[PDB]
Amino acid sequence: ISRVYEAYPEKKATLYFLVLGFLALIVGSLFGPFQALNYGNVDAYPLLKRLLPFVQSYYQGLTLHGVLNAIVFTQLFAQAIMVYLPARELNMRPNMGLMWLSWWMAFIGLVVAALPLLANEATVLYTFYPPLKGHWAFYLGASVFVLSTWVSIYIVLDLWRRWKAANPGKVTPLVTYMAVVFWLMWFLASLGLVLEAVLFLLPWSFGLVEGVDPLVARTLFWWTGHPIVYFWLLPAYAIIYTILPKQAGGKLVSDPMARLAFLLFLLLSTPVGFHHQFADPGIDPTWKMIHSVLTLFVAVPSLMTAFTVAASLEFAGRLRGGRGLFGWIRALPWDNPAFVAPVLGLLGFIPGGAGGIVNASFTLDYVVHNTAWVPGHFHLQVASLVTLTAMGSLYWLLPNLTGKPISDAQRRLGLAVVWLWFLGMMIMAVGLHWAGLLNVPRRAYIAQVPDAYPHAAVPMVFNVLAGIVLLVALLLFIYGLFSVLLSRERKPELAEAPLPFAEVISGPEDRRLVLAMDRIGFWFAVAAILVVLAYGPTLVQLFGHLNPVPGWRLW
Amino acid sequence: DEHKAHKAILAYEKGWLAFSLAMLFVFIALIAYTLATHTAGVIPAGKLERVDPTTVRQEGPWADPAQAVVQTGPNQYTVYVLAFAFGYQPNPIEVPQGAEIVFKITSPDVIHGFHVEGTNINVEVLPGEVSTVRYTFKRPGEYRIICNQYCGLGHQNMFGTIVVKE
Amino acid sequence: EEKPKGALAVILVLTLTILVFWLGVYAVFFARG
Numbered sequence: 001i002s003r004v005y006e007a008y009p010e011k012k013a014t015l016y017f018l019v020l021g022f023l024a025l026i027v028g029s030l031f032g033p034f035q036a037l038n039y040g041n042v043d044a045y046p047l048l049k050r051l052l053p054f055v056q057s058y059y060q061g062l063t064l065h066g067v068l069n070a071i072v073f074t075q076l077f078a079q080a081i082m083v084y085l086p087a088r089e090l091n092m093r094p095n096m097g098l099m100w101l102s103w104w105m106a107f108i109g110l111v112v113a114a115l116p117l118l119a120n121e122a123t124v125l126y127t128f129y130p131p132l133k134g135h136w137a138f139y140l141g142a143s144v145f146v147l148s149t150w151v152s153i154y155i156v157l158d159l160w161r162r163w164k165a166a167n168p169g170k171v172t173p174l175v176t177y178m179a180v181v182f183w184l185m186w187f188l189a190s191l192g193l194v195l196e197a198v199l200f201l202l203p204w205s206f207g208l209v210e211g212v213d214p215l216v217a218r219t220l221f222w223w224t225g226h227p228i229v230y231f232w233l234l235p236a237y238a239i240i241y242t243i244l245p246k247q248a249g250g251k252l253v254s255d256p257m258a259r260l261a262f263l264l265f266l267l268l269s270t271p272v273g274f275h276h277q278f279a280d281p282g283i284d285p286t287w288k289m290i291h292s293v294l295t296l297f298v299a300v301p302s303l304m305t306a307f308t309v310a311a312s313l314e315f316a317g318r319l320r321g322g323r324g325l326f327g328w329i330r331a332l333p334w335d336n337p338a339f340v341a342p343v344l345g346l347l348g349f350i351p352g353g354a355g356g357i358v359n360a361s362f363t364l365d366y367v368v369h370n371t372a373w374v375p376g377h378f379h380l381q382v383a384s385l386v387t388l389t390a391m392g393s394l395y396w397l398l399p400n401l402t403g404k405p406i407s408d409a410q411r412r413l414g415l416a417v418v419w420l421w422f423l424g425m426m427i428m429a430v431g432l433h434w435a436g437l438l439n440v441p442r443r444a445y446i447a448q449v450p451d452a453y454p455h456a457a458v459p460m461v462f463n464v465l466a467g468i469v470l471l472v473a474l475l476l477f478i479y480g481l482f483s484v485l486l487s488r489e490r491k492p493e494l495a496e497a498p499l500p501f502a503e504v505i506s507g508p509e510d511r512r513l514v515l516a517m518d519r520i521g522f523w524f525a526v527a528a529i530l531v532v533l534a535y536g537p538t539l540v541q542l543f544g545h546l547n548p549v550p551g552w553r554l555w
Numbered sequence: 556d557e558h559k560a561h562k563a564i565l566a567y568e569k570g571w572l573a574f575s576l577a578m579l580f581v582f583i584a585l586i587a588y589t590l591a592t593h594t595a596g597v598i599p600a601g602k603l604e605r606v607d608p609t610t611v612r613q614e615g616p617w618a619d620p621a622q623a624v625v626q627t628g629p630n631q632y633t634v635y636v637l638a639f640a641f642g643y644q645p646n647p648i649e650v651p652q653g654a655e656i657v658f659k660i661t662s663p664d665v666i667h668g669f670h671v672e673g674t675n676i677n678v679e680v681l682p683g684e685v686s687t688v689r690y691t692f693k694r695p696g697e698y699r700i701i702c703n704q705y706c707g708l709g710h711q712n713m714f715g716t717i718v719v720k721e
Numbered sequence: 722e723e724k725p726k727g728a729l730a731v732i733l734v735l736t737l738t739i740l741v742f743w744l745g746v747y748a749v750f751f752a753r754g
C-alpha cells in the first residue's frame with residue numbers, strides 16, 4: 001500500500017528491524033530502575049513481582065535486562081543502520097530476499113530464546129558462563145539470532161561488490177567503507193562465540209555431552225565478547241561521523257580520518273579479549289601484557305574520533321556564529337533532539353573512556369574487576385552514547401522510513417526524554433563507579449543483604465536518585481515513541497526525502513592516504529593474522545589440555 | 556576558510572595522535588613497573604593446573620579444611636581454599652602477617668570470584684582449574700572475602716573471611 | 722578559519738579526565754598493594 005515500499009522495500013525491512021529493536025529495549029529497560037534501586041539499597045522487587053508475576057528472581061531480571069538491551073536491541077539497530085545507510089548512499093537495493101531472511105532469523109531466534117528466559121529456564125545472564133547450564137532453546141535461539149548477522153554481512157558485501165563492478169577503480173564511498181570494514185570486523189569477531197556454541201554450548205544443552213571446559217568456554221567467549229561492544233559502537237559512530245555534522249549545521253571535517261578510525265577498528269578490535277580475563281587462571285601473564293597493550297592501542301580509534309567530531313562540531317558551531325573558545329557550543333541547534341541526543345552521549349562518553357582505559361591496564365583491573373565500577377563504565381558507553389544516538393536518530397530516520405512527520409509537542413517531548421536519560425545515566429555512573437571503588441560486587445541482589453555494604457551510604461543515594469530519574473525518562477520515551485508510531489499523519493514525500501548525510505571537507509593529501517586504506521582485501525588478511533597471533537598460542541595450549549566439567553543449575 | 560580549516564585540523568590532529576601514543580606508552584611503562592614489584596603477586600599463575608571438581612572434596616589438598624594451611628617456605632604458607640556454591644573453605648582462613656601467603660583456590664561446582672576486600676586479590680575461581688595467587692598482607696586482621704561473579708540465587712550472600720594474625 | 726581552539730578544549734578536558742581516572746586508580750592499586 002506504499003510505492004515508497006516498492007522502490008525502497010529496503011525501507012520497510014529497515015523499519016521492522018528498528019521496531020523489533022526498540023521493543024526489546026523497552027522490555028529490557030523496565031528492569032533498569034529496579035536494579036538501580038537495588039544498588040541504592042532499596043528492595044523494589046516484590047512490587048515488580050506483583051506487576052510482572054512471571055519474574056522469579058533478581059537474577060532472571062538481570063538476564064532479561066542484559067540480553068534484550070545489550071544483545072537484542074544493539075544487534076537489531078546495527079543491522080538496520082549498517083545495511084540501510086550503505087544502501088541509501090550507493091542508492092542501490094539490498095538483496096531483498098536475504099534481508100527479510102535475516103529479520104525472520106532474528107525474530108524467530110529471539111522468540112525461541114525468549115521462551116526459556118521468560119520461563120526462568122535460563123537465568124544465566126547474557127554472558128552465560130559454563131558450568132551454569134541454561135535450557136537448550138536459549139542456546140539455539142541466540143545462535144540463530146547472532147547468525148542473522150551473517151546474512152547482513154553478505155548483503156552489504158554484495159552491495160559493495162556490485163558498486164565495485166559498476167565503478168571500476170573508484171574509491172569506495174565513505175559510509176559504505178565504514179559498513180564494509182564494519183561487517184568484516186564483525187565476521188572475524190563472531191567466529192569465537194560461533195565456535196564456543198558449535199563446539200560446546202549446543203551439544204551440551206542437547207545432552208550429547210556431559211561436560212564443558214569453563215576456561216576455553218569463556219576464552220572463546222571473550223574472543224567475540226569484546227569486538228561485540230565495537231559491533232555496538234560503530235553503528236553509532238557511522239551516524240556521528242556522517243549524519244551529525246549535518247544535523248549540527250556544519251561538515252565532517254575529515255573523510256580519511258573517519259576511514260582510518262574504522263580501519264583501525266577492523267585491525268585491533270578482536271585480538272584484545274584477554275582484557276576481560278585478567279583475573280583468570282591458566283592464561284600466561286605475558287599474553288595478558290601483550291593484550292593489555294593491544295587494548296590501549298584499540299583506544300586510539302576513539303581518541304582520534306574525539307578530535308574529529310569535536311572539530312566538525314566546532315566547525316558547525318562557527319558557521320552558526322560561534323563566538324570564542326566556547327561560543328560555538330551555544331551556537332549549535334539544542335532545539336533538535338537528533339543533535340542533542342548524540343552530543344550529550346558523547347559527553348558521558350568522556351568519563352566512559354577513562355574508566356575503560358583504567359580497566360585495560362592489566363594490574364589496575366584487580367581494583368575494579370567484577371565490582372559495581374564495570375557497570376559504571378558501560379552504562380556511560382552503551383546505555384548512554386549508543387542508546388541516546390539511537391533514540392535521537394528516531395527524529396530523522398523514522399520520518400525517512402515511514403513518511404510520518406514529527407510534531408513540535410513530540411520534538412519537545414524528545415528533548416525531555418534525552419536530557420533526563422542523560423542526567424539519569426550520569427547520576428548512576430557516579431553511584432556505580434563510587435560503589436565500585438568501595439568494593440560493592442556487581443551481579444548481586446544487594447538490597448537482600450541490607451547490612452553488608454554500609455560504607456556505600458552516599459553512592460547508594462545516587463543510585464536511588466538515578467532509578468527514579470531513569471524510570472520517568474523510560475516512561476516518557478515509551479509515550480513518545482508510541483505517539484510517533486501511533487499517529488496516522490502520513491506525508492509520503494518526507495518519506496522520499498534524502499537522508500541528511502553530511503558533506504565532507506576534502507584535502508589534497510586525501511587521495512593517496514584514502515587509496516591505501518581502500519585495500520580492503522589486504523587489511524582483512526592482516527586483521528586475521530593478528531587474531532591467530534593473539535589467540536592461537538593460547539587456544540592451542542588450552543585445547544591440548546581440555547578439562548570439561550559437569551553442568552549446574554542454581555536458580 | 557574551510558580549506559584553511561582542513562590543513563589546521565589535520566595538522567593539530569597528527570599532534571594530538573603523537574601526544575596520545577606518548578601518553579599510552581607512559582601507561583605501558585608504569586604497568587611494566589608493577590609487574591616487576593612485589594605487588595605483581597596477585598597476577599594468577601600462568602600454568603595450567605587441572606583438577607577434578609567432583610572429587611576435590613573427597614580426596615586431595617582441599618578435602619580436609621584442617622589441612623588447608625601448610626607452611627611451604629621460611630616465610631611462605633600455602634592456603635588451599637575452596638569456593639563452592641555459597642561459601643568458602645576454610646572459614647575463616649587463618650594466616651600470619653608479613654608472611655607471603657600463596658593462595659591455591661578452586662571450585663567444585665560453578666565459577667565464583669575471590670575478592671579480598673582491602674587487597675588486590677581479585678581472581679576468578681574456575682571448576683577444574685586451580686587459581687594460584689600470592690599476597691603478603693602487611694596490615695593485620697579481619698579481611699572479608701566477597702564473591703563477585705554471579706554464581707546462583709544466594710550469590711549476593713556468598714561471603715568468606717581472612718584472619719591474618721598479628 | 723583558524724586553529725580549532727574548541728576541539729583542543731574538548732580533547733584537553735578528555736586528557737585530564739583520563740589522567741585523574743588512571744593515576745587516581747593507580748594510586749588505589751598501591752594503597753591496596
Ligand code: HAS
Nearest residue numbers: 229232275302306310346349353356359360369378381382
Ligand atoms: C559499546 C560499549 C562499550 C565501549 C565503547 C567500551 C569501551 C572500552 N572498554 Fe569496555 N571494558 C574494558 C576496556 C575498554 C576499553 C579500553 C575501551 C575503549 O574503547 C574506550 C575508548 C574511549 C575513549 C578514549 C573516549 C573517547 C571519547 C569521545 C570520542 C567523546 C568526546 C566528546 C565529544 C567530541 C563531544 C564534545 C561535545 C561538546 C558539545 C563540546 C575492559 C578492560 O579492558 C573491561 C573489563 C572490566 C572487567 O574487569 O570485567 C571492560 C568491560 C565492558 C563491559 C562488561 C562486560 C562484562 O559484563 O563482562 C561492557 C558491556 C563494556 C562495553 C564497552 N566498552 N565494556
Ligand code: HEM
Nearest residue numbers: 029032033035036066069070125375382383442443444470
Ligand atoms: C532504564 C535505564 C537503565 C538502568 C536504570 C540501568 C541500570 C543497571 C544497573 C544498576 C545494572 C547493575 C545490575 C547488576 O549488576 O546486577 C545494570 C546492568 C546492566 N545493564 Fe543496564 N540500565 C539501564 C539501561 C540499559 C541499557 C539501555 C543497556 C544496553 C543498551 C543496559 C545494559 C546492561 C548490561 C549489559 C548490564 C550487566 C548485566 C550483567 O551483568 O549480566 N542497561 N543496569
Ligand code: CUA
Nearest residue numbers: 667702706710
Ligand atoms: Cu560464588 Cu557468586
Ligand SMILES: [Cu+2]
Nearest residue numbers: 225226229276
Ligand atoms: Cu572489552
Ligand SMILES: [Xe]
Nearest residue numbers: 110113142145
Ligand atoms: Xe537472543
Ligand SMILES: [Xe]
Nearest residue numbers: 139142143197
Ligand atoms: Xe550462543
Ligand SMILES: [Xe]
Nearest residue numbers: 225226228229
Ligand atoms: Xe558482552
